[PDB]
Structure 1
Amino acid sequence: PPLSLLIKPASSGCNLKCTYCFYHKSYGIMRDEVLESMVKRVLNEANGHCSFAFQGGEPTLAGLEFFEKLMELQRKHNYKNLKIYNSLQTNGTLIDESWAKFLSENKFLVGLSMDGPKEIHNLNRKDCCGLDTFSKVERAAELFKKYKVEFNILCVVTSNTARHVNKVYKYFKEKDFKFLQFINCLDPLYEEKGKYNYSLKPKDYTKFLKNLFDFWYEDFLNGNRVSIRYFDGLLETILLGKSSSCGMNGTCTCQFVVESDGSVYPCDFYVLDKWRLGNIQDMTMKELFETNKNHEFIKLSFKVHEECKKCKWFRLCKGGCRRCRDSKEDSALELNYYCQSYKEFFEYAFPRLINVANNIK
């Protein structure tokens, strides 16, 4: 089968201090021997194609020469002539001409984190000193357009986002950003939910989804296509019965998260000792996947909540992402935290989602 990895080449290391972030133990920068062992194993084991996605942490802290070495390894060690996909998620604050050229020439797909216009973005996305970052992220987008880097925007949805969907959507529209991914702001794993100023509560999320869908659909009607990852996945589920977004298919998959020391985990939300599968230097990808830890991680997500069983939306929703059901350590999974939001949203949007699905055949 193809192989897809999520790599943290600078570990959890980051140059910012975003208020909601729980991703920034740092294993430091991935060493060359780990990088080499990882790239060779993937190219030897994968069939069809493989994908390397660089995340963190701020992955550009690994430095350009790390990524240059990566490309050289891919060039030399792809004995099967697999297709290779590379991608990078970045805060954009360190992007300069050298990065933009590299990313463009090497066909990376880039995800740039931008939470909306200046005020909405800076409220949470602050630097180490507590200062603003929006202008530096705009500069990154500017460099990406200049050098034709393919990029999507990754926007975290906080309570403030829910109150200002008009400003956020209009800003991205003004900037001609056509590929958007809205990520729910999660409270830290196993903490009491909804305790922070930024916390995205179910009633905030319902409001966000309904208003976003309205702006998206009005555009659709007017022939302006805007790709919104969640709505695309619903469309996929409607037309094909499956989605290419993890969290939308009802059960978990092993994401092969590789930390900078080579340790491997099943999902970016669960880089914890109890889910450490082993080390990529010493195990095959098959062996990691077939661990008792991975099998257990996945199988836990197969439990269907009783409310879901009789839910009219079950074939559309599937219970949502396991991370949003995991309220307490080693307690069984609960109903999705956002269950009420999906129900209220589906009642509001489903007729028009079908409308769209028909028109894209």
Structure 2
Amino acid sequence: PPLSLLIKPASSGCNLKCTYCFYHSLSDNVKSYGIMRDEVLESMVKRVLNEANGHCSFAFQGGEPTLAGLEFFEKLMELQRKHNYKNLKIYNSLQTNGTLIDESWAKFLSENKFLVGLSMDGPKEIHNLNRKDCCGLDTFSKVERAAELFKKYKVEFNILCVVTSNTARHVNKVYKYFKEKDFKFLQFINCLDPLYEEKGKYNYSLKPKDYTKFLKNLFDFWYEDFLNGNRVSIRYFDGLLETILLGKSSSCGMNGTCTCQFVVESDGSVYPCDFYVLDKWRLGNIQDMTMKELFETNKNHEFIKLSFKVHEECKKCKWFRLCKGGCRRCRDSKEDSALELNYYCQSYKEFFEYAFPRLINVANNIVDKLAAALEHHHHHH
């Protein structure tokens, strides 16, 4: 089929220590496999190019993927050029904290048509509250520097903003900052508490009541801009529009059930979702097994099967066709247990009662522009 992989080329290694981050190697309660060896990179690229049909996608995350260094990415591009025997279209993307981006990176990413996700939580004070370096110092100016480089070198990028309780209290400041910077492709990621911990216990924790307030305020700002002919693409609202018009969404977590994301750690180990890079969900190694073999594992089958359970409340919900129960990670409360109701169920219900009337209007407005914006959240065209 088409194949899409999420690769951690520096594993969980990172130069920052964001308060809410459970992905980095120096973080809460996460082993690092170091930098992906040339041999593992080559194995992975050739395998995807031989086994994919239609197209394939390589997404580089972590950890901070720029820690693998620019040479790693140059070798990636040489492998893609040499070994794409089927002449597939290849999509490449990079999610980065931005702090190591310089002119050499910006030129490389522009020249090689990468789609970049740049993590920025809002204006200076909001961003710096949680996104601190390993010495505990500020990072916002370095991220702004990366965004300016991306603008100068015409790199395609989205902003990835984590929604903490602070974000929810200050939607106006966040939305206005991104507007001033002319960042028109935004993705708001709900702050997740560490897996299987009791939810809502940290000062940054996004509780359901906070998330309701966030969604309603953000929608009002977005809709106002829409009425005034300023198009701002917000990934969730666009996913709602595409669910309304197409019956399905391009975003994992909006379609009711899980997919195998083919997360590849730097040792070549494979996992089904980036929220689940854990030994009990380790599918195998990409050096040893085909993508089909990995997908066909008992572990993958089970991971996907667990998400098909529909909560009883959802079956009767007026918004079910719109929401579909949300992302499995937001339903996974306890180790080895059946999924519960989405943590944010109440938030979605209240937001939908507030926003559904206006959502249709925009849905009736759209068309090619909506599909194109939605694609920008997924891959470089």
**Residues 217-273 of structure 1, C-alpha deviation per residue, up to 9 Å, x if partnerless?**
000000000000000100110000000000000000000000000000000000000
**Residues 146-196 of structure 1, C-alpha deviation per residue, up to 9 Å, x if partnerless?**
000000000000000000000000000000000000000000000000000
Paired with 1:219 and 1:243, the residues of 2 have a C-alpha distance of 23
Structure 2 matches for 1:146-157, cutoff 5 A? Answer: 146-157=152-163
Paired with 1:140 and 1:352, the residues of 2 have a C-alpha distance of 35
Paired with 1:5 and 1:165, the residues of 2 have a C-alpha distance of 33
Paired with 2:301 and 2:348, the residues of 1 have a C-alpha distance of 28
SS in 2 for 1:268: coil
TM-aligned CA deviation for residue 286 of structure 1: 0.5
SS in 1 for 2:86: coil
The runs of at least 4 consecutive aligned structure 1 residues that moved more than 3 Å come to none
Paired with 1:4 and 1:166, the residues of 2 have a C-alpha distance of 36
Match of 1:4? 4
Paired with 2:284 and 2:143, the residues of 1 have a C-alpha distance of 36
**Residues 15-46 of structure 1, C-alpha deviation per residue, up to 9 Å, x if partnerless?**
00000000000000000000000000000000
Paired with 1:114 and 1:20, the residues of 2 have a C-alpha distance of 14
TM-aligned CA deviation for residue 348 of structure 1: 0.2
Paired with 2:333 and 2:242, the residues of 1 have a C-alpha distance of 28
**Which residue, 84, 87, 95 being the options, matches 1:81?**
87
Paired with 1:167 and 1:290, the residues of 2 have a C-alpha distance of 47
Paired with 1:276 and 1:239, the residues of 2 have a C-alpha distance of 36
TM-score of the two chains, using structure 2 as the length reference: 0.94
Paired with 2:292 and 2:235, the residues of 1 have a C-alpha distance of 30
Structure 2 matches for 1:1-361, cutoff 5 A? Answer: 1-24=1-24, 25-360=31-366
TM-aligned CA deviation for residue 198 of structure 1: 0.1
Paired with 1:10 and 1:78, the residues of 2 have a C-alpha distance of 24
TM-aligned CA deviation for residue 131 of structure 1: 0.2
TM-aligned CA deviation for residue 331 of structure 1: 1.0
Paired with 2:196 and 2:240, the residues of 1 have a C-alpha distance of 28
SS in 1 for 2:79: helix
TM-aligned CA deviation for residue 82 of structure 1: 0.1
**CA RMSD across the alignment:** 0.3
SS in 2 for 1:271: coil
SS in 1 for 2:275: helix
Paired with 1:204 and 1:31, the residues of 2 have a C-alpha distance of 43
Extract unaligned runs of 5+ from structure 1.
none
TM-score of the two chains, using structure 1 as the length reference: 1.00
SS in 1 for 2:57: strand
SS in 2 for 1:9: coil
Q: How many residues align structurally?
A: 360
TM-aligned CA deviation for residue 341 of structure 1: 0.3
Paired with 2:263 and 2:196, the residues of 1 have a C-alpha distance of 21
